[PDB]
Amino acid sequence: AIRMTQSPSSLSASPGDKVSITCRASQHINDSLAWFQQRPGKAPKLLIYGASNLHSGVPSRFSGTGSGTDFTLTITGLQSEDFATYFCQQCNCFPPDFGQGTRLEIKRTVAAPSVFIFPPSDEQLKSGTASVVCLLNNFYPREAKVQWKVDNALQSGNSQESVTEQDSKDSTYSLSSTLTLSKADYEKHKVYACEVTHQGLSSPVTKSFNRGE
Amino acid sequence: EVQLVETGPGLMKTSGTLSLTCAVSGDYVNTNRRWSWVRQAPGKGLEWIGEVHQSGRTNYNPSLKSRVTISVDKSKNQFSLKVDSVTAADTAVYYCARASPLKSQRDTDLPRPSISAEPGTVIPLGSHVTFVCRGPVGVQTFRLERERNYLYSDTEDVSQTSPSESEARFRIDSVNAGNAGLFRCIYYKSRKWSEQSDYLELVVKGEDVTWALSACPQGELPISTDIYYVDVWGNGTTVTVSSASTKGPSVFPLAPSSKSTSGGTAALGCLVKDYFPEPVTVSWNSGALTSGVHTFPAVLQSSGLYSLSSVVTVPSSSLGTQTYICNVNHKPSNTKVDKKAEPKSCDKGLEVLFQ
């Protein structure tokens, strides 16, 4: 197959800025490339075909250039509907492979997360499992670090993360980290701590509790 | 104008034949398009499944060619995808698409024609191949030309397929070795000949011989000089495959450690855990609580079940002022559980756990 590599993987901007995304093919494809826009949850939509021709009905702020191996989609008048994910597709050879996509995110002033820790309910420990939850509230950007310490020991492999989408008004993110242990393992230790490192934070913030209190 | 809707199972069991159909509205499937299927795993991007051509030729991504089959039913204007023996990794949102030979909205009224082959451009010796020359409307003559040992053939049978296209067909019934080589179309209209089309090579395959001149990677010659772009996507249908069964969620409170050196604001949530069918609605106080809620995406654990959390942030003085109830309903089992989250009392002493 032909490998299409888009650049960058992610990108941050504000309404009004002009942005450009690159797609490089492994070999020459003679303009046989298309640009698609996919907003979160909805279905993809054609922007440009033949690497430079604007599809009917899509606004003229979008523009396609390039050929041979290098192509560029550029938006000039960024609006709120443009904040989506963009894909390139080669359409010359048999497997018309897509690019891995580039996500376009709203640029925002840095904001520190509000950190909270949640011990497992007594109703959950009846079933023999304990889940402790760490919440990071309304921070920007997403790059954040959560680490669990159980009696001062760094935990790995027993926690899963899940982060929201960029919120409609503040353009902020929220993260949830869940540490899941057996009731047997939860019994063995006392102090449960969640330690969060974020660029909006001068120093890492540690929230903790003692089991039983 | 054109609309494609996908229908299929919402939930399907592992190891079974997945079947989806696409209903086309506002266009006929027996036209010069390629009806395709494209797949998107949860948060992983686009993967192209395959396509079907007007001639009935299908093409599958060699990743799944073992398991995929695409077919068309012209009577009801639908086309279907069948993928066999599914892994859990086949869980995804599936899109049907219409790939069309879009052309630059340039118009010379004398644009360059295109040439295509049906069923394809590699034909076994003795089998048939058909060239389809296409150009603008009103074409009076179509000629198919062969480059080396130059011979040509005229045809004046030409059909309108739209108010802007016309096409003509040349059929070779039993291809031999001397039919292999380069082919192109040229049309006569408005008292003069047009530009020649680009070349399309037809290869003939024999017992141990391949008659080909000596473009794309390993093989897979193009079969038309027109590039087909997908200009119409359906909204997609999400299909989930899992070795599991419909199950109601367990709901647990996430209480803010009543006195926790808490400052101005407080947080508290509900943890919905181990529910199979994907959609669950979480509203707090049945709607009266709107600003400040954040409910997170589900996570697929190796349990085959999902779990998420929903959280609200509140004034830190709202301990006794308001009692918070989270309202989680799981329609696929119609399990409507509502649990009030409040902090644990420090009267009862020290909770001890062992064994």
Residue numbers in the entry:
A (entry chain D): 2 to 214
B (entry chain A): 1 to 214, 222 to 362
Task: Quote the passages of the study that discuss this structure, keeping the authors' original sentences.
RIFIN, a large family of Plasmodium variant surface antigens, plays a crucial role in malaria pathogenesis by mediating immune suppression through activation of inhibitory receptors such as LAIR1, and antibodies with LAIR1 inserts have been identified that bind infected erythrocytes through RIFIN. To define the structural basis underpinning interactions between wild-type and antibody-inserted LAIR1 and polymorphic RIFIN, we investigated the overall architecture of three types of LAIR1-inserted antibodies, determined crystal structures of LAIR1 in complex with the RIFIN-interactive regions from two RIFINs (PF3D7_1040300 and PF3D7_0401300), and used the resultant structural information to derive a LAIR1-binding signature and to identify RIFINS from diverse Plasmodium species capable of recognizing LAIR1.
LAIR1-containing antibodies have distinct insertion modes, including type-1 insertion between V and DJ junctions in CDR H3 region, type-2 insertion in the S region between VH and CH1 region, and type-3 insertion in the S region with deletion of VH and CH1 gene. To gain insight into these three insertion architectures, we determined structures for all three types. Several putative critical LAIR1 residues involved in collagen binding, such as P190 and P191, were mutated in LAIR1-inserted antibodies including MGD21, thus reducing the collagen self-reactivity of these antibodies.
